[model samples]
Target: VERPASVVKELVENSLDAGATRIDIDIERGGAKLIRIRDNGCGIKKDELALALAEAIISLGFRGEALASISSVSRLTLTSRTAEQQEAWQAYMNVTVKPAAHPVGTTLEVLDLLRTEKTEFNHIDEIIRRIALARFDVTINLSHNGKIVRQYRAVPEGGQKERRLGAICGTAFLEQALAIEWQHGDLTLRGWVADPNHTTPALAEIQYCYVNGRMMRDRLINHAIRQACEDKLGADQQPAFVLYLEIDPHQVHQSRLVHDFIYQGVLSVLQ
Candidate 1:
């Protein structure tokens, strides 16, 4: 029994991990009674329904513990659909209770929070801000007591199709920079760099960087941005940038430990 906002956070994170491009979230009465989350992503398989409800750890990614924690403190119901399977499945569970599967994709509801922490409707705004920084093409909608509280929508650019290669590659120190293109099996890196004078601020404020089509934080990529900005910006100023990288899922290290790999890789390029 936590606050409504806590349930919102858990469900939103789940949608992200599920590869949902858009998410709709709703809450009521300071989240004391009802909360619902819906998304369009790779829904869970019917066979996996039991596991999802039992809070059994599956490699479905993101922080799997979110389901367990939410279930422990509130009642949760999940429904998802997979295009290949052509059918939806549903599951519901709560503290000391096991989840049961039903149908897929459209609906996921969390009800009757038990813990009652100090939370307010305004917190939804903070969550929306964080989502914006992530830069994923997701839409967030929040409502309280039948009134809309927060609404945010983002659509990422680049790559009409999935890239075969990963985004972010070798350093581009001078005028001749690398570029990026999306291919079937792997991502391609190609692009021009600043002519020292055209450089912007620091590596941090660069125009854009992407993995496949998704924006990400990487160290090596940041390194390239810094190199591009090297002498262009003032001593305290960072560099401006317009760059892209591509990487197929095969090339990306999707392990739980690879959380900051993108940041590290991009920064290294700057060094």
Candidate 2:
């Protein structure tokens, strides 16, 4: 990322990643120094989701040798807001400036999977439905054919979950999926797991797992699923399931609190 691109993405990311449920694409053009983001949209807590950014992407923000690439930035301003205020709050050095923490959602990605997959569309759809599973509270607006495909956001409770679940797993899986909930001491796990008996395999089959809302491909999670499915699956075919795990931040190491729902998916879009 270069000068203004970094500036815009970082600022917008800061607001969205924090907790701002609403954001404005505040842009003023003429020269670079004069870029501005509006107020409230700038809440400062990370996650609770978007792209490969200061926290997500590796190089979108300047560091080490990469810092030298962005040149001739005379002045820069990075601003944010507090939880109490309905306004924009307000950063550089050796002409350097520091802004603060950042999300987990699918804005764009799938395309970035092309870096390795080339024309592969498998990873692309994987990330889309991956985040859609856990993000019941936050609205996910998806577009296809340059028009609104479906905006997915469901409340965490009640008859509301499966409505969005159908969007992710399709009508067939939604019909056969079974309920799941498990807990051990401080660690808790819960989610619906569809019976492979009623399912077939595909590149886009929904297999969701999360810790505290962050979606991931952890070995333990996979092991658990494999162990459970080992006896049930036939020799030539595989099963599809969706799992949700929750561990209080206190139970684990102090790190990202919320799940990275489609974290890489959004990263691919930004990069």
Candidate 3:
């Protein structure tokens, strides 16, 4: 899948995993010549730059391997800047990789192409389609031979201005309207659930949950929602809901072990 779309998906996933609110991808020669991904994500630390270029090691799962894979097939350059840092640093790697640390916010540039297999442009489209269905907020841009091909922002509507999940029957509404507020925090949970009267198209429609502004399927939280609606809803009838949970990086476990479990658990719970 050396097609432009496959490269775009891999790079975009990296950006999303990095807690980026926005991501931009540029491609040339059907992504056969050049590919660049830039994001305002939590950047790699100066000390970690060397590790980013190495193979099979990453603080966040196998991300370093992902970097290595891209580098193995092409020329890769990584530049970053942290909010606390004043200047940016960059690393250039091709065949023989190397890591050089700098500031925050990650910018990854991938060049050249050596995929000998059949090019699957359609596969790339399918990957992008799934990403769209997943509904995470991101921006993607594509260009070929200096000509613009595609540009999209996952949520064109203002980030916080999207439609709110309405009420449905059997769903539990915080009866007390308690406010879980903090003086200084990065995450803030907001949103409401459906009243019992509100019908759902399917079981999937009954549970809506978001973490750190990203809509996700979390079992623990979803179970809590279902339990809250159990008595009010019928066995055959699925309820409706729209609930949001805010999680700050500080509150959430960033370690690879915990991170892997959290996402897996969330998907399992929803299923």
Candidate 4:
């Protein structure tokens, strides 16, 4: 998680966990010196300002390791305020708590040492792009060296999701995709796949598969798509698609769904 992109992801997830609707991320020197995140999420209380301990990790997706692990290897400063508080509190180096002027949200600054802005920013951009697609309702602004490079606006359901996809993956992919939806019992699969007739080799790089909103690189999912698009796809060209498969948490097993239901469904759609 020391990678700048991973660091960015961890902090962004924290913002989302706090129910942030808009997040502003600023990186300096491709996170070699600074990575700051400002989010309009619920802020932390002054008394509960342990940014490197139990509650911090428990409140986040990584449970016990995220903030603790990240802070151990980097310099992290957190400033936050909740609606209930009169003033914001700032915690630096887990050493002291100081009063700071901040709104009813949080700002986290992580600093250490790192890479070229172009090289590191590309990795950061890729992660943000994937996150933009997954959470269309959340606005994300990314800036590098004080210059805003990318901004994804929040959009409600309907045709707006496609426009968001076009923005992130390029209009060419959107222009050549076929939107699809399939549902059976507790399972639902939805999203867009490249129009087999219009696919190009470049489109092959756009495959993104998600399960219950989390991205996955499962071999079985790819194999199923490959099997379905075998004859239609050019040699060495993979399927160009963004697919989301949703199954209830109570479902028996995912592998079975992949083997029995999903395989046939993909075969049915691609042809």
- Candidate that would win on lDDT: 4
The candidate, 3 or 4, that scores higher on TM-score is 4
Report lDDT per candidate: 0.51, 0.43, 0.52, 0.77
lDDT of each residue in 94-131, candidate 4, tens digit only = 35788989989888888873456678878888899888
Name the weakest run of 10 consecutive residues (lDDT summed) in model 3. 161-170
Query: Per-residue alpha-carbon lDDT of model 2 for 48-120, expressed as tens digits?
Result: 1111121344333322112222222333333333454233322222322233432221111111000222122
Q: Candidate 3, which segments miss by more than 4 Å at Cα?
A: 1-4, 55-57, 93-104, 113-126, 154-271
Model 3: per-residue Cα lDDT over 1-271, one tens digit each: 3555766787778777877766656655556667677778777655455556653335553456677777676677777766764567665532333344543577777776445322443445445434542443665554445665555455555553131111121223333112222221443444444443443454334455557555676565555555444544443344444445555464333434333333332323333
Worst 10 residues of 4 by lDDT: 55-64
Candidate ranking under lDDT, highest first, comes to 4, 3, 1, 2
The C-alpha TM-scores of every prediction are 0.50, 0.50, 0.48, 0.85
Write model 1 residue lDDT over 21-139, tens digit each, in one string: 76767766656667777777667655555456563437753434566666666666666666555556566633222334333354567666334333555565455444543433566
Model 4 / residue 4 / CA error / Å: 1.3
Query: Which structure among the candidates has the greatest TM-score?
Result: 4
* Superior candidate under TM-score, 1 versus 3: 1
Off by over 4 Å in 1: 1-3, 55-57, 61-64, 93-106, 113-119, 156-271
Scored against the true structure, residue 83 in model 4 reaches a CA lDDT of: 74
